[PDB]
Amino acid sequence: STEISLEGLHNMGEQLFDGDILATGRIICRERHTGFHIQMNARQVEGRPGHYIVQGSKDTQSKLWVRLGREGWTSPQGIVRSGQEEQVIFDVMADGNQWAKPGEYIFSVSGKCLTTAVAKTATSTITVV
């Protein structure tokens, strides 16, 4: 009914630029729907849906400022896109220029199909070398 996948770039450098795609995913809905919901399981930037701070896997102090969205997403805690089509593509991007501490960053994203729904989660890891 509802399947979600997320795929990293798979050899990051330390210097990131605004908009740099760090990961890509899709949501598939096979039952009738009017749209898609997507959210990242990460701390959100204050009052700004779609924008997140991802922490390091072993470092705590290592942070990555990142945003969701590709085409037509919007603020309704989570962001939303309309469509009856079977699937959407979405991107996780570097939010402004930044210098990432080396290490590992786990992106974790959950999605719903829009008709009280059940969300599936997908995760991808990036390594800043």
Numbering used by the authors: 0 to 9, 11 to 76, 82 to 120, 130 to 143
Copy out sentences from the published article reporting this entry, exactly as the authors wrote them.
Different AAF variants are expressed by different EAEC strains, where they are required for the bacterium's adherence to small and large intestinal mucosa. As with Afa/Dr polyadhesins, AAF consist of two secreted protein subunits, a major subunit (A) and a putative minor subunit (B). In the fiber, subunits are linked together by donor strand complementation (DSC) with an N-terminal Gd donor strand segment of one subunit inserted into the hydrophobic cleft of a neighboring subunit. In this study, we report X-ray crystallographic and NMR studies of monomeric, donor-strand-complemented major and minor subunits of AAF/I from the German outbreak strain and AAF/II from EAEC strain 042 and provide an atomic resolution model for the structure of the entire fimbriae.
In EAEC, the minor subunit of AAF/II (AafB) has been associated with the release of cytokines, suggesting its surface localization and function in EAEC pathogenesis. At the same time, based on the fact that minor subunits of AAF are 12–23 residues shorter than major subunits, we hypothesized that they do not possess their own donor strand sequences and are stabilized in the fiber by strands donated by major subunits. The minor subunits AggBdsA and AafBdsA have more similar structures than the major pilins: 117 matching Cα atoms are superimposed with r.m.s.d. of 1.2 Å. The donor sequences derived from the corresponding major subunits form classical donor strands (Gd), each inserting five donor residues into the subunit core structure. The values of shape correlation statistic (Sc) calculated for the acceptor cleft-donor strand interactions for AggBdsA and AafBdsA (0.733 and 0.756, respectively) were similar to those calculated for AggAdsA and AafAdsA (0.784 and 0.804, respectively). The good geometrical fit between the donor strands and acceptor clefts suggests that these interactions are native. As predicted, the minor subunits have no N-terminal extension that could act as a donor strand: the first residue in the mature protein is structured and immediately followed by the first strand A. Hence, this structural evidence suggests that the minor subunits assemble by accepting donor sequences of the corresponding major subunits. As such sequences are only available in tip subunits of major subunit polymers, the AAF minor subunits are likely to be tip localized. In minor subunits, strand A is not split between the β sheets, but locates entirely in the sheet 1. Instead, strand C2 that in a classical Ig fold is hydrogen bonded to strand F, in minor subunits is hydrogen bonded to strand D and hence belongs to sheet 2.
